[PDB]
Structures are given as structure tokens and as C-alpha cells.
């Protein structure tokens, strides 16, 4: 197969860029305590989530998919798959939180101050983390390193999630698709769409009534739409693949195993590089700290 070389390259590149990006974001947000604003506190939580997603998911997916065997043990299967599902859960709920912050900030600006101080930020972060650790508890319990043997007569293992009833496994993936994609996606569409309506109504009202401020707003609207579109492009493939694997399991596995799911997951982790770019390296008030930090 020619695909391993491009898989290895694009994984290594996204891993390097994600480690550099998220650790730079972390170091800039912890070295500049003046920068630890409420929003930047959520961006730190997101950057940590995305670093954890990179460091756990990318090695222990690329390596097993290149080797077509889970060389690690059942404990590593359980631990990795827990941290994967967790960092997906947290990353999504942090994107939701930033959508709802921006909705308060722009669409209800005067009321917003009453309900987004640092205390609300930390309480919501702790809530999303602890909830995510709770609802991901099925992974370490019911993930198992189910054995097989390849035609080389090698003994081999695959880390797979097999909730006991197949019908409960379908309930589970429908629940995860809903709570961890469709509702997050609806909420981000509602939030960033209302923000975009507010901003464009401002633009059209000024065109009826500064040009640099109109450019700054169209740049914000663009960046928000890029957030929504790249969230759907990152996550609709993985979650559709998992829903297919839940309902028509063998038909999904027969087509997506190996290279297709490897790139679908590469998109899912590309989210972890995209997010710190858009939310940090594109922001002025973060660039002005990166050049100030070490």
C-alpha cells in the first residue's frame, strides 16, 4: 500500500503542530496572569483538552492502524480510550461554552456581565470535566482487548468497545451522536448565527446611516463561520462512521477499516490543531502575549 507514507507524514505533521500550538497557548496563558480572562480561561481548558486529545489519540490510533494490532495491553486500551472519549467530550462542551459566552457577549451584551465572571467560568469548566468523566465511564468498564489472529499466524489484539447488548450499543452511539454532536452543533449554529445576524444588522444599519470596524466585523463573521463549518467537517465524518458501525456494523467496518477511518480520525484530531489557531493565534490579544512571553 502506498498510503502508510502519507498517513505517517500527515499524522506526524499534525501531531507536531498540535503539540507546539497547544503548549504555546498553555505557556502564554499561564505566564501572563493578566491574560487569564474568562474567555482565555476557556481557551486554556480547550487547549489542554486538545493537547490531551493529540497526545493520547494520535499515537494509540496511528500505531495500531499501521501495525494492524494493538501491541499494548488491556489496561492501555482502557486508559487510552477513556482519555480519548473524555477529551472529545470536554473539547466539544468547551466549544459550546465559547459559543454561549460569545452569544452573551455580543447578542445580550449588558446582561452578560451578571452571568460570566471567573467563578462561572471555573464552575462550568469543572462541571463539563466531571460530567465528561462520568458519562465516559462505560469506556474503561466495557472496552476490551478482544483477541484475534492474523493469517501470518501472529497472535494479535484489537481494542474495541463492546457494550453487552448490541441494541444497547446502538442506544449508546445514538445518545453520543445526539448529546456530543447534534445538540452541540445546533447550539453552535444558534449562537454563531444569532451573532452573525446581530453583526450584519449592525453593518446594514451603518450602511443606512468606521470602515475599519466594518472590516473587523466581517472578519469576525468569517472566522465564526469558519468555526462552524470546520467543526462540522471535523466531526460529522467520525460520528456518522460510528453511527453506521453501530447500526450496520459489518457494512461500515468492511468499507471504513484502515485508511478511511484513519483519515476520518485524522480530521477529528485536526480539530485539535484548528481550534487553537482560530481561538488563539488569530486573536490580536493573544498574539500580543505570545511575543511578550518566553
Amino acid at each position: 500500500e502506498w498510503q502508510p507514507a502519507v498517513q505517517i507524514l500527515l499524522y506526524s505533521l499534525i501531531f507536531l503542530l498540535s503539540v507546539l500550538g497547544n503548549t504555546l497557548v498553555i505557556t502564554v496563558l499561564i505566564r501572563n496572569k493578566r491574560m487569564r480572562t474568562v474567555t482565555n480561561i476557556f481557551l486554556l481548558s480547550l487547549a489542554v483538552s486538545d493537547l490531551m486529545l493529540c497526545l493520547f489519540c494520535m499515537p494509540f490510533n496511528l500505531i495500531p492502524n499501521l501495525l494492524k494490532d494493538f501491541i499494548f495491553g488491556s489496561a492501555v486500551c482502557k486508559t487510552t480510550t477513556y482519555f480519548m472519549g473524555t477529551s472529545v467530550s470536554v473539547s466539544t462542551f468547551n466549544l459550546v461554552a465559547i459559543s454561549l459566552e460569545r452569544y452573551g457577549a455580543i447578542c445580550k451584551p449588558l446582561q452578560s456581565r451578571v452571568w460570566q465572571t471567573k467563578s462561572h467560568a471555573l464552575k462550568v469548566i469543572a462541571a463539563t470535566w466531571c460530567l465528561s468523566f462520568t458519562i465516559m465511564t462505560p469506556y474503561p468498564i466495557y472496552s476490551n482487548l478482544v483477541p484475534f489472529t492474523k493469517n501470518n499466524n501472529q497472535t494479535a489484539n484489537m481494542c474495541r468497545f463492546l457494550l453487552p447488548n448490541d441494541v444497547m450499543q446502538q442506544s449508546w452511539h445514538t445518545f453520543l451522536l445526539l448529546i456530543l454532536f447534534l445538540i452541540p452543533g445546533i447550539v453552535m449554529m444558534v449562537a454563531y448565527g444569532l451573532i452573525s445576524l446581530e453583526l450584519y444588522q449592525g453593518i446594514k444599519f451603518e450602511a443606512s446611516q468606521s470602515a475599519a470596524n466594518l472590516m473587523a466585523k466581517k472578519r469576525v463573521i468569517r472566522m465564526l463561520i469558519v468555526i462552524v463549518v470546520l467543526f462540522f467537517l471535523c466531526w460529522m465524518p467520525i460520528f456518522s462512521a460510528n453511527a453506521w458501525r453501530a447500526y450496520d456494523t459489518a457494512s461500515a467496518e468492511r468499507r471504513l477499516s484502515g485508511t478511511p477511518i484513519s483519515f476520518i480520525l485524522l480530521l477529528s484530531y485536526t480539530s485539535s490543531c484548528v481550534n487553537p489557531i482560530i481561538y488563539c493565534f488569530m486573536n490580536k490579544r493573544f498574539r500580543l502575549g505570545f511575543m511578550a512571553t518566553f
Partner: peptide, 8 residues
């Protein structure tokens, strides 16, 4: 063989 993928 190796048919499958971890959920995430």
C-alpha cells in the same frame, strides 16, 4: 483482518 476502529 483487523476490522474495526476505536470509537473516537
Amino acid at each position: 483482518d483487523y476490522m474495526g476502529w476505536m470509537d473516537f
